[PDB]
């Protein structure tokens, strides 16, 4: 029911498709989105729009921040390593 739920699905499915596979699409991040939606990644009745990042981050709490990291620290470090090394969104 959370934004954590929402977001971890974004990040993890993204991560899997970038990590040992296809980085060139995270480059031009619209290409990324539509290969990630392809999977069966669903949101609010609809496919993902990049505009809704406002609806992502604002609605998370500190509680949730900690959590996101704490539960899937493997995935946090995973993308954090990608972030500094490849390219900053």
Curated annotation (Swiss-Prot):
Signal peptide: none
InterPro entries, sorted: AsiA, AsiA_sf
A Pfam match: AsiA
GO BP, one annotated term: regulation of DNA-templated transcription
Keywords: Transcription, Transcription regulation
Superkingdom of source: Viruses
Role played: Transcriptional inhibitor. Inhibits sigma 70-directed transcription by weakening its interaction with the core of the host's RNA polymerase. This allows Gp55 to successfully compete for the core enzyme. Plays an important role during the prereplicative period of phage T4 development.
Subunit structure: Interacts with the host sigma factor RpoD, and thereby inhibits its interaction with the catalytic core of the host RNA polymerase.
Name by which UniProt lists this protein: 10 kDa anti-sigma factor
Native source organism of the sequence: Enterobacteria phage T4 (Bacteriophage T4)
